[PDB]
Amino acid sequence: SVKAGSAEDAAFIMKNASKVIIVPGYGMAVAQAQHALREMADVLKKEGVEVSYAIHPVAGRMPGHMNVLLAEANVPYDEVFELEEINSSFQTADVAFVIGANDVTNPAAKTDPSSPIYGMPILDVEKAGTVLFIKRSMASGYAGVENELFFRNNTMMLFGDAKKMTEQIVQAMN
Template sequence: MLQNNLLIVAGMLVGAAGLILTQIMCKAMNRSLGNVLFAKFGEDGGGGGGSDEYTGVTSTTAEELAPLLEAAGKVLIVPGYGLAVAQAQHKCRELGDLLEKEGAEVAYAIHPVAGRMPGHMNVLLAEADVEYDKLFDLDQINGEFSQTDVTIVLGANDVCNPAAIRDPESAIAGMPVLNVWESQTVVVIKRSLSAGYAGIKNELFEADNALMFFADAKKALEDLVTEMKEL
């Protein structure tokens, strides 16, 4: 087998691709390779982010959100692992199209490590035929949140946790994140208040301008589309 040059070259290409993806992931998390491989991420981050750690969380429903979205002039959508698990990319695109018909400007904010690997969200949204020029990475989109009426966080957690910027003792301190909290209103679609990969509390969920929509991503989007069509 080792004498098969094609297999050797193929193995080298696979290894090189894996190394490149790993480097992208480490840069996006502001972590060294050794830290990613061997450190216990979030071990001193202040707990696991269970519901008992949160106070002042404001929950909402599709019926309440529909008028808010209908009136929005600019909407940013932040997809995360929850979107992938629910296979909600097509419903996400449907909601985006509906918002545009209502006159809103819609774009998608993609964090480099959202999902299982770099580029995961790009692939899912491309599968749903979301136009590529509507996808923006962290560096391109972060300046837009302060000018956004509504940001919808779809199953993302650590990649939009303000502790990365505000708390130097946090397990994710220094990690580049999407500044979604700068939006006028943030709608977080998530099944529960459970922690993300870092295992820490997300202060975003308690923010004054944050609304928590507790539901599976696909079901939540289906309900939002239905409610908006009935307005």
């Protein structure tokens, strides 16, 4: 039940990856971690890695929430993709770097038909080789439900502030 990793663990995983799709959520906005995030991506793609951003239509707490913040952080528009055109890319991604998202990934939207999140379309982060989730604790998202993706084989919990944790990961990348 739940393997926990550190900044340095997440650095090794993404440095030794061909493809990484970042997946931002409210948590990223709260911590205001866009700038550290975009720095991580451009030192990630300096290493030859291929980098995308996957934006869920209802990430954050308003429409266009992730978009404004990635825009202030100078993320190119050509790297930013909507759910419907990027959900099949997860199959071929070594890492799904989930930063401050939760509900946006929970596959109880597909499975558990009594769930509050049932029917919602979600990002298929489970299809990636391994998922890195950044959040402070084990609390739920908006929906008040647990995420099964947390305690399963190929997932990794990075316990901290999204801005601090990302900053720390950029440090260990050298």
